[PDB]
Amino acid sequence: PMVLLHKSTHIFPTDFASVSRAFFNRYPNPYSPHVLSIDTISRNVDQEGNLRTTRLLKKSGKTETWIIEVSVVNPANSTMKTYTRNLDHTGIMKVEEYTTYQFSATSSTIADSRVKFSSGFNMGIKSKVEDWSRTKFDENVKKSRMGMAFVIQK
Amino acid sequence: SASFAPECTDLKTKYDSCFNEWYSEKFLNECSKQWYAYTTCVNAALVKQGIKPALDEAREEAP
């Protein structure tokens, strides 16, 4: 269904270790009052030496929504990739966020984020408008044909 | 940081602190005991919340 993608870049003036640990310890903070809980579903060191983690968040808004967060930390390359998406209300809207953190020229951690918003109601509106147009078409065709018969009658 | 099940929150903190040490110092699986405690609590809570409503609804009979 309807898909939209936006991209942004932010540079943290800190080491990759500090930024990564902070990502894993983000809540609670005064700038994110909507997060209600975080839970670590899985965490291991993969065959390539990269830390794979899957965490589970819950959030409020204007009413509560579950969110999955997948993350890979390559310590050899000092890189990190994060992805997040809601698990419920997926038929209404799906918000996916993909961010890459990399580390020395500026001695900073660059985070390139890209969010994909995909709403599925674009077809749910079309289906109801389709039934509506079918009904209106039947009614109008019947009325027009009956008027034509009436005027043949004269 | 809370947990979706409050009874697990303290075990979650006990895993999170150990994993923070492990990550900050060693990695940049020694916390397996607190990990077992936390994952057991979380598995029990997931079982409860996600499964039991169906069973308690299906338990509706002359006992």
Author numbering:
A (entry chain B): 0 to 61, 74 to 114, 116 to 166
B (entry chain A): 6 to 33, 40 to 74
Excerpt from the paper describing this PDB structure:
Ups1 is located in the mitochondrial intermembrane space and is a member of the conserved UPS1/PRELI protein family, which is associated with mitochondrial function. As the binding partner of the Ups proteins, Mdm35 facilitates their mitochondrial import and protects them against proteolysis. The role of the Ups1/Mdm35 complex in lipid transfer was first reported in 2012; thereafter, Ups1 was recognized as a lipid transfer protein mediating PA shuttling between mitochondrial membranes.
To investigate the mechanism underlying Ups1/Mdm35-mediated PA transfer, we attempted to obtain the structure of PA-bound Ups1/Mdm35. Both Ups1/Mdm35 and Ups-Mdm35 fusion protein were co-crystallized with PA with different acyl chains, including 1,2-dioleoyl-sn-glycero-3-phosphate (DOPA; 18:1–18:1), 1-palmitoyl-2-oleoyl-sn-glycero-3-phosphate (POPA; 16:0–18:1), and 1,2-dihexanoyl-sn-glycero-3-phosphate (DHPA; 6:0–6:0). Although we obtained DOPA- and DHPA-bound Ups1/Mdm35 crystals, only DHPA-bound Ups1/Mdm35 crystals diffracted well. Two Ups1/Mdm35 molecules were present per asymmetric unit in Ups1/Mdm35–DHPA structure. The Ups1 molecules also form a domain-swapped dimer. In Ups1/Mdm35–DHPA structure, each Ups1/Mdm35 contains a DHPA molecule with high real-space correlation coefficients. Residues V66–G72 at the α2-loop could not be assigned because of a low electron density, suggesting the high flexibility of this loop. The phosphate head of bound DHPA is proximal to the positively charged R25 side chain, and the H33, K58, and N152 side chains are adequately proximal to facilitate electrostatic interactions or hydrogen bonds with the phosphate oxygen atoms. The sn-1 and sn-2 acyl chains of DHPA were stabilized via hydrophobic interactions with T76, I78, M104, and V106. Structural comparison of Ups1/Mdm35–DLPA and Ups1/Mdm35–DHPA revealed that DLPA is inserted deeper into the positively charged pocket than DHPA. However, in Ups1/Mdm35–DHPA, Mdm35 αA and αB helices interact with a Ups1 molecule, whereas its αC-helix interacts with another Ups1 molecule.
